[PDB]
């Protein structure tokens, strides 16, 4: 697919893609190295990140974002922006006078890289905290676990 759907050229800023080509420099292939990094904390770089072609500067694996801070989990509830999803974290808040709990939830707008295709509503996502990416986004989707019902 064409990765150049923007008014400006999309590229990985750390990759030089027009190193000089000559007869010896080209033998039936142009070649294009792919910048990717191994984020920490045991998270493995998805295969599509390594062998993909998308340009996403907020992607944890091939972009310019450092995963540091809280590592949370949520359930995907809305996928209707570009490269951003809304997940819902459900918890119980303890009211002490009644010695009981009440259901509460918080929505979280988190960045989803193009490396995670086939993400559905109800999927569980492990997200990691990064620097502010937009007005409301501060977490990047690190891992996707499909909801029970995969067959």
């Amino acid at each position: 697919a064409d990765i150049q759907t923007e008014r400006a050229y999309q590229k990985q800023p750390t990759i030089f893609q027009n190193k000089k080509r000559v007869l010896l420099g080209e033998t039936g292939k142009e070649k294009l190295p792919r910048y990717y990094k191994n984020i920490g904390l045991g998270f493995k770089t998805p295969k599509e990140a390594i062998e993909g072609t998308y340009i996403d500067k907020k992607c944890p694996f091939t972009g310019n974002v450092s995963i540091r801070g809280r590592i949370l989990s949520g359930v995907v509830t809305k996928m209707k922006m570009q490269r951003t999803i809304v997940i819902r974290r459900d918890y119980l808040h303890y009211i002490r006078k009644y010695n009981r709990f009440e259901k509460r939830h918080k929505n979280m707008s988190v960045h989803l890289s193009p490396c995670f295709r086939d993400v559905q509503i109800g999927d569980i996502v492990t997200v990691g905290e990064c620097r502010p990416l937009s007005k409301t986004v501060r977490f990047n989707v690190l891992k996707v676990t499909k909801a029970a019902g995969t067959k």
Binding site: L92, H93, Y94, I95, K97, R100, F101, E102
Partner: protein
Amino acid sequence: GKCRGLRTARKLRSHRRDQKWHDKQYKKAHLGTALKANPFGGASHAKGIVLEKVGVEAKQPNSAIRKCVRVQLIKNGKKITAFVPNDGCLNFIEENDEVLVAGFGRKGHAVGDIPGVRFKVVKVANVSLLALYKGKKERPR
């Protein structure tokens, strides 16, 4: 019966909070209408100007003239009626002089056989009614 579930805290707290408004004292304290209607405006005492001496008839089972005064409060220009407690103490009050009035002791309710009167005079002309009654002090000249 009532709900007994580990996740009913919202239900219990909200039901208690809604049902507290049917408590007359809680509603009177937290609605703000009573504070607005209170001539003292939340104060324990208030200074006022005596407009006239008024005699209030005791309620039907009893029979007397309760010697009160109509006063206008300096703070808000409201007109109240205040009992002059002891005997001969109405003679200690003139017209158009300043009096300190307090509540009558029921937190805004009438006391005894004095209809519609919920205040009592404490001072007159910056001298307490007790001092004038006991002769310890005299009103200024």
